[PDB]
Write a protein that binds this ligand. Structure first.
Ligand SMILES: *OC(=O)[C@@H](CCCCCC)[C@@H](O)C[C@H](CCCCCCCCCCC)OC(=O)[C@H](CC(C)C)NC=O
Ligand SMILES: CCCCCCCCCCC[C@@H](C[C@H](O)[C@H](CCCCCC)C(=O)O)OC(=O)[C@H](CC(C)C)NC=O
Ligand SMILES: CCCCCCCCCCCCCCCCCC(=O)O
Ligand SMILES: CCCCCCCCCCCC(=O)O
Ligand SMILES: CCCCCCCCCCCC(=O)O
Ligand SMILES: CCCCCCCCCCCC(=O)O
Ligand SMILES: CCCCCCCCCCCC(=O)O
Ligand SMILES: [Ca+2]
Ligand SMILES: [Ca+2]
Lengths: 382, 382
């Protein structure tokens, strides 16, 4: 029946909220009003889905949630990890988009921003398990999620990344992960965990859910004891250069998977060597773009508003090949780097810059159909 | 002591709120965060003021209100006018900015958007009175406001208008005047009249103020009977082509007043001869710009986003002369039409397009100093 033999799962980045979990007024993540990715691709005959995973959590908490979003079941972050970071072992429970997901039945994974990192960690868990959980289950018995055991291959056909900070972003190191902004973020999470909230921001495993009989005052008091306030097991840390390099160091190439990256630039060179945002960079990124563009190291400057080009092209020290837009993108085991999209800021990729009339719906539609054609090539040349 | 002999009064347009009356988060009307008109001109030794008048009311209502803002006193709309339109005769009471304003002690008047029309009407009342109120006062005794008496001359030095729709705007005829949109506007005025509201949107003469012991239900019932819902005594009607033509058909040139106008363009010709908004036109004006720009009469197309050029230049039936940027703007009795400001949209005049990096503070600084230097000239040459 569907044109693609393997389902496509789109994975959102940091601050992303999709589907039922989006606030009452909030942009449609995959395509804004420009090209409604999920709905239009379904209409054309493709089987596509929009994953929903923590908007503020770590790559690790998100990757476990992605496994359960696809497979179904109750999220198990692992006993060793829960105990090490001081959050709940068990999280939400998902119905599962493909409850029969197993070696043989594969999925295509497409990630935007942080979603690109989360996809890689999940593949890493399927193939290799999680050593600390294996050791923990060895020493203490109990149950271990099959996500953590390793040995599970032929489950992912492809990994495609769009403006992913594979090597981190200075917009995290210098704002985002600063004390003052982590506090803003975490206050927002506490608020949206109140007894009348229908929207889950992705940190309830740290205690941010007010109980039905608990006053707000007591809730503030309970949740100020949470480890979240000083932990690294969160997105803001993960997106920093250190945080993303930890992830690069624990991943490896799968020789069966087709890897491919897209990257945009939306900065231009100032007469001093520094990069400044183009007119029509989504305006919420004027400051983050300047921070990146004024880096001491010249090759870290060119950026999309919030991720530097060097971070998006591919994980550093992982094999890659610059590829053209024409040729098939059909090589396995190697990051295929697509030519830089000129004038595309971070959010032009998902269509939510409603202020920018140069980036047209017809264009974004061609962009996503181009990905889908590549994914169909991957299937045809298996 | 102040460098200008006559005080300069700036008059906001439709939807404008200023000072104490501005909502909690709301732009600083006179210069945004670009150039703080009032505070900076004061700092440079000029005596300037921003009038606070009705944001949604008619030119008539607003002109009466302007008179009291300057003079001090209890707003009197006139008994004939209150009885013909169906609203309160009396309104707000103003402390007065020049309590001794009389023939001999002039004021300079500058108006943005509808401000410019309001200013023309107030001066018509000062000079020639309101004949309807005279004949009401003939018939029934009681009091007549001096604003309606007539023969007050030599009270305003100058009328200068920025992006004022002297001949209306189709954005009113099509948008901002229609039934469905009048309802939205009146709805909001109803709500801002609630008994916890500290902000006055300027239609409380029509019944829009909740009593302290009146429930919101009874308020709705009561104000439902107001004539506001079907009247023309309102801004939306007055900004239409017929609305503004009516004001033109009853104003005339005072030959001792110095008249000058300014006009912005922020549209460009498309391949069919229609006008579309430039990149940079404040985005809340995209649709209104297209409505104007697609007019069937070619001369009505070029626009600043919300007012067509042919409307801003001069009242169509009054005398004018195209003036250069450098000629001292010193002629009495004739609309001196300043050259069009290329790339300036409707709101770049007051500096609030925080999204347009091409329109800088220092540009807006020179523009306003420009206006003051021309007012100084008016003084210097009596
Ligand atoms: O996952 C990501 O790709 C992430 C890239 C890393 C950048 C780290 C920055 C901390 C990125 O998308 C994050 C970006 C953040 C936008 C910053 C907002 C700052 C407000 C400042 C106030 C204005 C005056 C200075 O997130 C988005 O673009 C976001 C989600 C993306 C995944 C698209 N938008 C949609 O919700
Ligand atoms: C930072 C936020 C800026 C908001 C600007 C949004 C403009 C939306 C369209 C509103 C129509 C325009 C209406 C025009 O001014 C109006 C022109 C006539 C237009 C008729 C169409 C209703 C006028 O000149 O008084 O209103 C605004 O731009 C207002 C105040 C205006 C006196 C400057 N903006 C609010 O301050
Ligand atoms: C116009 C009156 C609306 C007031 C109702 C709610 C009270 C809160 C006030 C703040 C909202 C003001 C809306 C105007 C938004 C523009 C402000 C901006 O440019 O940041
Ligand atoms: C009345 C429902 C309130 C919904 C919460 C607002 C969420 C803020 C996001 C604003 C961005 C936008 O939707 O344009
Ligand atoms: C439109 C954004 C409003 C931000 C107001 C600041 C309040 C911050 C503290 C929040 C803590 C909490 O409510 O749990
Ligand atoms: C336009 C602002 C967004 C909120 C929409 C509320 C619509 C309610 C209309 C009735 C106004 C009233 O409460 O008197
Ligand atoms: C978050 C704001 C999005 C605005 C999208 C552009 C379409 C708005 C149409 C005209 C706006 C108005 O004046 O009400
Ligand atoms: Ca953009
Ligand atoms: Ca502008």
């Amino acid at each position: 029946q569907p044109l693609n033999k393997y389902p496509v799962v789109f994975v959102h980045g940091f601050l992303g909220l999709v589907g039922d979990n989006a606030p009452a007024l909030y942009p449609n993540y995959w395509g804004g009003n420009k090209f409604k990715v999920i709905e239009e691709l379904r209409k054309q005959g493709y089987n596509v889905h929009q994953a929903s995973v923590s908007a503020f959590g770590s790559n690790y908490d998100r990757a476990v949630q992605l496994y359960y979003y696809i497979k179904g079941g109750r999220v198990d972050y692992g006993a060793a990890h829960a105990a090490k970071y001081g959050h709940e072992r068990y999280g939400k429970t998902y119905k599962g988009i493909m409850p029969n997901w197993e070696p043989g039945k594969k999925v295509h994974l497409v990630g935007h921003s942080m979603g690109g990192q989360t996809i890689r960690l999940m593949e890493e868990f399927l193939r290799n398990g999680n050593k600390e959980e294996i050791a923990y289950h060895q020493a203490h018995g109990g149950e271990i999620s099959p996500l953590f055991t390793g040995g599970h291959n032929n489950m992912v056909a492809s990994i495609t990344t769009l403006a992913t900070p594979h090597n981190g972003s200075q917009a995290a190191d210098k704002f985002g992960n600063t004390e003052a902004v982590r506090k803003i973020m975490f206050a927002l999470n506490r608020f949206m965990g109140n007894k009348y909230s229908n929207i889950d921001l992705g940190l309830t495993q740290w205690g941010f859910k007010q109980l039905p009989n608990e006053s707000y005052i007591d809730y503030i008091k309970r949740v100020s004891k949470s480890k979240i306030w000083t932990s690294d097991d969160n997105a803001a840390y993960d997106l920093t250069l250190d945080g993303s390099a930890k992830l690069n160091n624990m991943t490896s190439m799968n020789p069966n998977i087709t890897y491919t990256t897209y990257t945009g630039v939306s900065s231009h060179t100032g007469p001093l060597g520094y990069e400044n945002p183009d007119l029509g960079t989504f305006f919420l990124m004027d400051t983050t773009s300047r921070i990146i563009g004024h880096d001491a190291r010249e090759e870290w400057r060119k950026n999309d508003g919030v991720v530097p080009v060097i971070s998006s092209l591919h994980p550093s020290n992982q094999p890659f090949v610059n590829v053209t837009n024409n040729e098939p993108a059909t090589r396995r085991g190697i990051w295929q780097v697509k030519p830089i999209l000129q004038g595309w800021d971070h959010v032009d990729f998902i269509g939510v810059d409603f202020l920018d009339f140069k980036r047209k719906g017809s264009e974004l539609a061609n962009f996503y159909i181009g990905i889908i054609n590549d994914l169909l090539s991957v299937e045809a040349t298996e």
